Amino acid sequence: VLARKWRPQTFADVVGQEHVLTALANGLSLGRIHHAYLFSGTRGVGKTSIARLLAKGLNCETGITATPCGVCDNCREIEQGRFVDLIEIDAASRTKVEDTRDLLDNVQYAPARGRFKVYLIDEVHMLSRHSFNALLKTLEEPPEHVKFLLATTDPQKLPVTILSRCLQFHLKALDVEQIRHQLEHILNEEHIAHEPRALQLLARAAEGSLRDALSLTDQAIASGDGQVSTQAVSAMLGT
């Protein structure tokens, strides 16, 4: 679907989180790396995308950069989600509760391939109290070669002892114009027909989320004869 196909592959592909992208790039470019990053914000605004690019910028074979090359093996594997040094943890999953608990109790201090062992934790506020302390403990005695990239829609639900040990970045819900322009850009690249009004209606219905925006666009295309027209979208949205 559009959402997976148009996942940001470079900071330049990211829509509207400038204040965050400028700080991450400055830090990366000057070799100033903190041990833990926290990305907060609502739904589908780009938290995981940015965390993933940061992990990519940190392990690029080309060197620590704010512009991962995107063609080296480390970059390709991270992209595929099959990189040995990018350990993805989902605190919100009912199914991976043990793996979540175990991996955090057994941090692998030495990367096997890349220069850093990276942990990316989704919805970190949903971790058990046990794991919170496991994490805290690691953030208190920062293993080198190991970086923690946390994401969450509710930073406040997080123990202040942990929040305090991260570099916090607050992502904003995206503007109607920010979303509208991205949809237009994507549809132009896909060579899919669209009408101005139709895109305005989808951007508005997305209500701040680029992911919901792409999901609504994919539904529009599928139910509207392989195109995005004002008439078909209005009917679909109940305009």
Ligand SMILES: Nc1ncnc2c1ncn2[C@@H]1O[C@H](COP(=O)(O)OP(=O)(O)OP(O)(O)=S)[C@@H](O)[C@H]1O
């Ligand atoms: N700022 C953005 N710029 C460009 N595309 C984006 C942006 N935010 C979201 N997208 C699209 O939305 C999809 C999901 O975005 P994510 O980065 O996973 O959002 P998120 O903020 O982590 O959302 P959750 O998991 O619901 S909290 C991506 O694969 C993109 O196609």
Ligand SMILES: [Zn+2]
């Ligand atoms: Zn690379």
